[PDB]
Amino acid sequence: CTASIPPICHXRWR
């Protein structure tokens, strides 16, 4: 999970 704009999340990995 990253605080991008928009943010990015690959489930429970990043």
Side-chain angles (χ1 to χ4, degrees):
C1 213
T2 34
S4 296
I5 305 173
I8 311 302
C9 290
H10 282 327
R12 278 170 80 192
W13 273 84
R14 176 68 86 76

